[PDB]
Design a protein around this ligand. Sequence first.
Ligand SMILES: Nc1ncnc2c1ncn2[C@@H]1O[C@H](COP(=O)(O)OP(=O)(O)O)[C@@H](O)[C@H]1O
Ligand SMILES: CC1=NC(=O)N[C@H](c2ccc(F)cc2F)C1C(=O)N(C)C
Ligand SMILES: [Cl-]
Ligand SMILES: [Cl-]
Ligand SMILES: [Cl-]
Ligand SMILES: [Cl-]
Ligand SMILES: [Mg+2]
Ligand SMILES: [Mg+2]
Length: 265
Amino acid sequence: QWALEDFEIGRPLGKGKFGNVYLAREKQSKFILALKVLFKAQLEKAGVEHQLRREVEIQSHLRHPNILRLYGYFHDATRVYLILEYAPLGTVYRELQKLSKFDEQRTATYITELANALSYCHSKRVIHRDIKPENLLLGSAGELKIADFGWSVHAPSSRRTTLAGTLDYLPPEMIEGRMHDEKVDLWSLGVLCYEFLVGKPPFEANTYQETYKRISRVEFTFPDFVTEGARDLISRLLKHNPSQRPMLREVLEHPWITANSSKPS
Ligand SMILES: Nc1ncnc2c1ncn2[C@@H]1O[C@H](COP(=O)(O)OP(=O)(O)O)[C@@H](O)[C@H]1O
Ligand SMILES: CC1=NC(=O)N[C@H](c2ccc(F)cc2F)C1C(=O)N(C)C
Ligand SMILES: [Cl-]
Ligand SMILES: [Cl-]
Ligand SMILES: [Cl-]
Ligand SMILES: [Cl-]
Ligand SMILES: [Mg+2]
Ligand SMILES: [Mg+2]
């Protein structure tokens, strides 16, 4: 069906470990979209063919306004191409570099949109496992959209693949290589809420070794400007024991969230 000739390619949107992502327009329809390009040699050398498969399968079936659509794929001799919904306002990562910190209302709105999307996912027992700002995209009305389902799986779960870069968003049970489930995404939600308000993630350090220590011991502290209600929500999400972390419903109904978010459930 689809081939490279069906598209005109435009500017680079971003770079991943494997993904090189371009703006593109389909010739017959003039449909604007994003084209995620992957090198077959790189995928093979790293041995992550199963991740790509899961990304396509999971993200093509999901339908939710806060989850990025995947329309299709094709491949030639050297490359694989994923056909994605184009997110015109870019990444949450970028927006954070621009503004340094988000205010409480921006933060709570983003957390609600996140919790809504994750609730939809967990209902099918899909866990994302790689929730972080570079993988959170923004729509034309500024609405948050979860993307990059490469690490996602069905629960319960062990980990078969080597951890790549930053440990910053991962809970103790996943970095210690133990078994894990849905609550991993709840931990990550707490890490994000903190980073949104403060400008950096709670377990950030100079070395991999030190970050691992701070995560496994849950060693974090708050700046003075973080309010009582945000402290309450964040402290509930970052529990060492996954079973003590709240349900997503409790997050969406948390007093600080409801007082400050500009969107519903
Ligand atoms: N649909 C999209 N619209 C706009 N930018 C995107 C889109 N998809 C990815 N990007 C940009 O490209 C980067 C890499 O994409 P991603 O799919 O996360 O690759 P990887 O799987 O290698 O992490 C993202 O961090 C983002 O900056
Ligand atoms: C149906 C397919 N048949 C193929 O022969 N190769 C593809 C392939 C699959 C895993 C992979 F890591 C790399 C690949 F090129 C393929 C596929 O499902 N894609 C998602 C591109
Ligand atoms: Cl179409
Ligand atoms: Cl497993
Ligand atoms: Cl795995
Ligand atoms: Cl729930
Ligand atoms: Mg990514
Ligand atoms: Mg990926």
